[PDB]
Amino acid sequence: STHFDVIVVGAGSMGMAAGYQLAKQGVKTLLVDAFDPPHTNGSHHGDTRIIRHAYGEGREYVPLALRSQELWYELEKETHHKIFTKTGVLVFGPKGESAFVAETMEAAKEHSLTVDLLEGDEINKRWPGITVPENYNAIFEPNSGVLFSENCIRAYRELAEARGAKVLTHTRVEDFDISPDSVKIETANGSYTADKLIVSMGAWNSKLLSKLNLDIPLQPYRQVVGFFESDESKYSNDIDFPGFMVEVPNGIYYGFPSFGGCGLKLGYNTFGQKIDPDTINREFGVYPEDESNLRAFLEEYMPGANGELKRGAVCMYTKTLDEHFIIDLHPEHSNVVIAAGFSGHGFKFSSGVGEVLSQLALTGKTEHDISIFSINRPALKESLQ
Ligand SMILES: *Cc1cc2c(cc1C)nc1c(=O)[nH]c(=O)nc-1n2C[C@H](O)[C@H](O)[C@H](O)COP(=O)(O)OP(=O)(O)OC[C@H]1O[C@@H](n2cnc3c(N)ncnc32)[C@H](O)[C@@H]1O
Ligand SMILES: [Cl-]
């Protein structure tokens, strides 16, 4: 016997941010999650997340990256939880052989971002612990950095609840009942109604959006990361070792400097096992590529951080065909908002997306230009049942 103004299904990276934005405006919101955010079953754990401004995936992402950065700084001031550390982010690759590096440089240029350009030995000299061939070039962004993702969701939740938002945990939404003037969700713990619905179930979007008559290609991928014992005199955040995302002949890798001696963290971005969020094996090391792919990179580019494995984590990417996000209203229901397919690089934007989702749910529009994330774009191959 309780109606809400807005219901958010999937209170993760995007959903909890949306809940915070809605709650702050006095909007009666209900957030429902299959677990208890932040948790280790979705796509937000692993402790840290890189945030970049100069965007190699496309310069059209810069505006939202900058707005998100400002929002992260605001969150830092609103909670006791640590939110962001300005490690700066280094991007490098073979000269003339990386579209990612090239677009990163062009994005910085087009938006007048503050960055350093260096190559060959200059990279090795500036950052002891990095060893790249002389034919490698790079762009360093000193003002971007590292976000503590679990703290972000935890802070957004605590703030949202303090303002009246209700969070229903360990409740898996199984179906949706949408009408022209209301929305209703079904769960093992009961049904709820509201005026608007926000759908942000991460990897599970690939299995439940069909319940909304949507047939959009979304592939979940098993993506691991490892923390390795490193030479702290070189890889510690304290000695300014940067966060990074680089492209080498065999793919794209990303990493973080050691924080308080937790060890350098590394991940392989271009490769992962195709999986189902309900049957994925979340144990690190069950595939010999888990650890081998990482050490193959370390022994060649950051030899001093190829020590004993301290910790491992298994997480998920949810890719769209063009690897661009999906942030839009449901084509058949203006009272339903969709957030999906962040394709492995959406957390840094979660703060900004929360704001966008709030605007879409309340007004059906947003001040941000989200055209590249249209649910109707061709490269997506979207359709109905
Ligand atoms: C996996 C990964 C991703 C990643 C990364 C490293 C790894 C190993 N590093 C990143 C980085 O350095 N910078 C960056 O910008 N992004 C990076 N990423 C990607 C980012 O983490 C993902 O894009 C992001 O987390 C996507 O957010 P989203 O909100 O989509 O996913 P979620 O956080 O998993 O939240 C979904 C929630 O919904 C719930 N759920 C699922 N099904 C249901 C049902 N049926 N009912 C109710 N709730 C449901 C989940 O429980 C989850 O909490
Ligand atoms: Cl993702």
Curated annotation (Swiss-Prot):
Cell compartments where the protein resides: Cytoplasm
InterPro entries: FAD-dep_OxRdtase, FAD/NAD-bd_sf, MTOX, SoxA_mon
UniProt GO cellular component terms: cytoplasm
Annotated binding of FAD, by residue: 5-35
Any one GO molecular-function label of the UniProt entry: sarcosine oxidase activity
Positions bearing S-8alpha-FAD cysteine: 315
Keyword Flavoprotein: yes
UniProt keyword annotation of Manganese present: no
Main subcellular location of this protein, as a coarse class: cytoplasm
Regulation affecting activity: Pyrrole-2-carboxylate is a competitive inhibitor. N-(cyclopropyl)glycine (CPG) is a mechanism-based inhibitor and inactivates the enzyme by covalently modifying the flavin.
Names of the cofactor(s): FAD
E.C. number: 1.5.3.1
UniProt catalytic activity: sarcosine + O2 + H2O = formaldehyde + glycine + H2O2
Domain of life: Bacteria
Alphabetically ordered keywords of this record: Cytoplasm, FAD, Flavoprotein, Oxidoreductase
Cofactor descriptive note: Binds 1 FAD per subunit.
Enzyme superclass (EC): oxidoreductase
Described purpose of this protein according to its UniProt entry: Catalyzes the oxidative demethylation of sarcosine. Can also oxidize other secondary amino acids such as N-methyl-L-alanine.
Recorded family membership: Belongs to the MSOX/MTOX family. MSOX subfamily.
Subunit structure of this chain's protein: Monomer.
NCBIfam families membership: PRK11259.1 (NF008425), soxA_mon (TIGR01377)
The protein's name in its UniProt record: Monomeric sarcosine oxidase
Originating organism: Bacillus sp. (strain B-0618)
Gene, per the UniProt record: soxA
